[PDB]
Amino acid sequence: ATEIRELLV
Amino acid sequence: VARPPKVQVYSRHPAENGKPNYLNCYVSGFHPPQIEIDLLKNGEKMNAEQSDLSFSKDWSFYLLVHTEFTPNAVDQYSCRVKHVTLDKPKIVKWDRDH
Amino acid sequence: GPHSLSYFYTAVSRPDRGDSRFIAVGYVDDTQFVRFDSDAPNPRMEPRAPWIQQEGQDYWDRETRKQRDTSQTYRVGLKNLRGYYNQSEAGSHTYQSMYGCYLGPDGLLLRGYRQYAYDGADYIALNEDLRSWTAADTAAQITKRKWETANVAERRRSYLQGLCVESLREYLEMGKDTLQRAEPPKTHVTRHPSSDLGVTLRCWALGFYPKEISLTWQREGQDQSQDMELVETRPSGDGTFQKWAALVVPPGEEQSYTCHVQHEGLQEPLTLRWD
Incomplete structure (x- = not known):
């Protein structure tokens, strides 16, 4: 299962 | 910098004339990912399937282009690769010994 | 691993x-x-x-x-x-x-x-x-x-x-x-012309999974990793992998060389030679 979300670079 | 593709052309099973097989063109180590990989039968583009874009631990991409084929003694098969690192297309001929 | x-x-x-x-x-x-x-x-x-x-x-x-x-x-x-x-x-x-x-x-x-x-x-x-x-x-x-x-x-x-x-x-x-x-490789050895003083022996491993494999040529017990030509492991198209290792040997001396194959799909390593 992938990571739920990540923060903008 | 941009990295040029390595190319291998090979069949899934040892080739036997008149026996159905699969023809692979494995293209790896390149960057950026924009690339044109064509399997050719007697110089004519085959409608071959291409794998999903992935990459290795050094960030360089790899792709598999592949299709069914039935080798014989007459037909010539090759893989043609166009990439920004190549001033003209790279052509690798298929032969059953590699 | x-x-x-x-x-x-x-x-x-x-x-x-x-x-x-x-x-x-x-x-x-x-x-x-x-x-x-x-x-x-x-x-x-x-x-x-x-x-x-x-x-x-x-x-x-x-x-x-x-x-x-x-x-x-x-x-x-x-x-x-x-x-x-x-x-x-x-x-x-x-x-x-x-x-x-x-x-x-x-x-x-x-x-x-x-x-x-x-x-x-x-x-x-x-x-x-x-x-x-x-x-x-x-x-x-x-x-x-x-x-x-x-x-x-x-x-x-x-x-x-x-x-x-x-x-x-x-x-x-x-x-x-x-x-x-583990799916073990199917193996075989082919022979091909090369140049003046040598023919190529190519040791093939087909259809194995997972990717890790060891293919080595050994001239009389001692490993020949000098001009062993070893291609990158490549996908078969069906989820398994392929590899080969080749070396140039003196004509008439083919039977002095052995290809050793280690893969987790095999019970024990293989020893192949030219037919």
């Missing part, structure tokens, strides 16, 4: 079309099992191995929602990165991430990782402690401070120690019949 679950994200800007393209693929060990492509109409996470298809609609809905959100974050991110480097608006650039977990013999996270690249160069990476970042240049230091401010590393660590390992364990059981079964 240890089993692993790994994801690979590629985002590419397309100024001519005014957008970007995001492609994700997931692997368990050497087996691809999902994909997502923002260019697909109504894009969803899609199965790419038979055993993952038993996941129900809630799994595919959840994975689709995460990839759609991530696609949008990497789209905006490509714009931020162009600004960081004061690059022209007309060029295409590439933003990559890979992350994953290896399963320890105790069922815990053996090693987790999360790394990013911009235009093929390391940009920022989560350190081995899963608590801090290493940034490669001035641009990546901007990203580093934003992610430190937002405590991003704690969420990466929780995912890597938690859901990554738990979902890996679930996939390993769902696909046990293929993921946890």
Whole structure:
């Protein structure tokens, strides 16, 4: 299962 | 910098004339990912399937282009690769010994 | 060695079309099992191995929602990165991430990782402690401070120690019949003309899984790794792998050479020679 979300670079 | 593709052309099973097989063109180590990989039968583009874009631990991409084929003694098969690192297309001929 | 679950994200800007393209693929060990492509109409996470298809609609809905959100974050991110480097608006650039977990013999996270690249160069990476970042240049230091401010590393660590390992364990059981079964190579030796003083012996290993294999030629017991020609291991097209190792030997001396094949699918290493 992938990571739920990540923060903008 | 941009990295040029390595190319291998090979069949899934040892080739036997008149026996159905699969023809692979494995293209790896390149960057950026924009690339044109064509399997050719007697110089004519085959409608071959291409794998999903992935990459290795050094960030360089790899792709598999592949299709069914039935080798014989007459037909010539090759893989043609166009990439920004190549001033003209790279052509690798298929032969059953590699 | 240890089993692993790994994801690979590629985002590419397309100024001519005014957008970007995001492609994700997931692997368990050497087996691809999902994909997502923002260019697909109504894009969803899609199965790419038979055993993952038993996941129900809630799994595919959840994975689709995460990839759609991530696609949008990497789209905006490509714009931020162009600004960081004061690059022209007309060029295409590439933003990559890979992350994953290896399963320890105790069922815990053996090693987790999360790394990013911009235009093929390391940009920022989560350190081995899963608590801090290493940034490669001035641009990546901007990203580093934003992610430190937002405590991003704690969420990466929780995912890597938690859901990554738990979902890996679930996939390993769902696909046990293929993921946890070694397929040994089919082997044979061919002979080919080379040049004045030598013929080529080529030792072939076909159809094996997993990818790791050892092919060696040995001139009279002692390893011949001098001009052994060894091609990169390549996909068969059916989820298995292929490799060969070749060497030039004196005509009439073929039977002095042995190819040794080690693979976890074999009960014991093989010893092949020219017919």
